[PDB]
């Protein structure tokens, strides 16, 4: 019965300072939340690295600090260094139970930004001879690596049929996803112009078909 | 060498309950509390409750009251959880970990999560369909669709294709799961050359190749 809210995605480069906060929708954190800031690498990898606002965990660079500032509990970077990649959570207390924020997707430039690489295809025939029809949308090579999916038929943005993938790490240290949107035999045959559009690092890109 | 031990996966039916485990060791038990955290991959992290290894006192997110249950074995160093009345919504990581309750207030060491895949089907083989595009280099892939359990294994060429490859994650959609995968070769080689993709799925032996032909 509390929301925290986190900031979304979060770039920096190699040497930078970065502040993360974790906003409480009831009121000021304070100390007597308890702010918590756990790291989640690949893998579902977690590790713990400030407690009760501003104790570090043992084994955690200093480079991590915690504290409150304003009304809000911040974690700060300083020096991130590329291995920061990563999503952080901050985790609230409120005398009985925990919240947890949505977590930051921290970028930390490791490589050039690089732009992503979309392609939609469209229902094959031998699916659309099992009443069925699926566009596929796939991105690649996209740096940092948060992207926003959006489709839209004949104009309208779809809202429902439509799932999109998490981010997967390609070799190359690069990102990719994959959005699919599913149909009827008979949706498909009705609707008459599918779009793919890729949000990322500010540009869009827009892959259309066209039945 | 402080360690929290989970299982990886747990595969159950519907309907049905699971006891997830979580084995300490390399630490006094006593000295930590334990937390238990769901996260769906694509939201956030849920708390769910936390025990007390010495007195077996537990407390919960009123959301989870009714859903988990905590449980401790001190002799055996484990704290374990069950989840009743599972659904496929209940599909999800669940995580333990410890939290410096008379120190300085941190979940410091976190346990690596069991999957919980909550499904009614029964091992069911992919069914693989072409992507060719519609109008330098061109993308084409595979689309290997509603096959179980996980995984398939993809491949371009019979191996020979292996620059340009992506193969993305698979999705549980509707109790079966549905992947992809995608190479870039010049524009050249196809349509000239043949573009094979080849989807082997080891739980029910299928091995299917499927040649991309434009369309």
């Known amino acids: 019965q509390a929301v925290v809210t986190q900031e979304s995605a979060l770039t920096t480069s190699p040497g930078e300072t970065v502040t993360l906060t974790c906003r409480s929708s009831?009121?000021?954190?304070?100390?007597?939340?308890?702010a918590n800031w756990v790291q989640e690498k690949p893998d579902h990898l977690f590790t713990g690295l400030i407690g009760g606002t501003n104790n570090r965990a043992p084994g955690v660079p200093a480079r991590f600090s915690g504290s409150l500032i304003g009304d809000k509990a911040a974690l700060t970077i300083t020096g991130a260094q590329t291995e920061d990649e990563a999503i952080y959570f901050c985790?609230?207390?409120?005398?009985?139970?925990?919240?947890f924020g949505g977590g930051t997707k921290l970028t930390v430039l490791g490589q050039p930004k690089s732009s992503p690489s979309v392609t939609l295809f469209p229902p094959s025939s031998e699916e659309l001879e099992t009443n069925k029809a699926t566009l596929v949308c796939t991105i690649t090579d996209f740096y940092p690596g948060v992207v926003t999916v959006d489709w839209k038929v004949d104009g309208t943005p779809v809202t429902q049929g439509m799932e999109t993938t998490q981010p997967s790490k390609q070799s190359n240290n690069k990102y990719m996803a994959s959005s699919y949107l599913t149909l009827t035999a008979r949706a498909w045959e009705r609707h008459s112009s599918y779009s793919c559009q890729v949000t990322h690092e500010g540009h869009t890109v827009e892959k259309s078909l066209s039945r | 060498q402080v360690q929290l031990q989970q299982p990886g996966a747990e595969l159950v039916k519907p309907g049905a309950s699971v006891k997830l485990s979580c084995k300490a060791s390399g630490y006094t038990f006593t000295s930590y509390w334990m937390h238990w955290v769901k996260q769906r991959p694509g939201r956030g992290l849920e708390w769910i409750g936390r025990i007390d290894p010495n007195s077996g006192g537990t407390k919960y997110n009123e959301k989870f009251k009714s859903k988990a249950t905590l449980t401790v074995d001190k002799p055996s160093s484990t704290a374990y959880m069950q989840l009743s009345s599972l659904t496929s919504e209940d599909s999800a990581v669940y995580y333990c970990?410890?939290?410096?309750?008379?120190?300085?207030?941190?979940?410091?060491?976190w346990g690596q999560g069991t999957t919980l895949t909550v499904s009614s089907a029964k091992t069911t083989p992919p069914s693989v369909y072409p992507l060719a595009p519609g109008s330098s280099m061109v993308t084409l892939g595979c689309l290997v669709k509603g096959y179980f359990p996980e995984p398939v294994t993809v491949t371009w060429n019979s191996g020979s294709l292996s620059s340009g490859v992506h193969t993305f994650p698979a999705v549980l959609q509707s109790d079966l799961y549905t992947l992809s995968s995608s190479v870039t070769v010049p524009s050249s080689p196809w349509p000239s050359e043949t573009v094979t993709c080849n989807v082997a799925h080891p739980a029910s032996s299928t091995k299917v190749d499927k040649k991309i032909v434009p369309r």
């Open positions: 970990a410890r939290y410096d309750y008379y120190g300085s207030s941190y979940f410091d060491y």
């Open positions: 985790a609230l207390w409120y005398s009985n139970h925990w919240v």
């Open positions: 009831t009121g000021a954190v304070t100390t007597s939340n308890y």
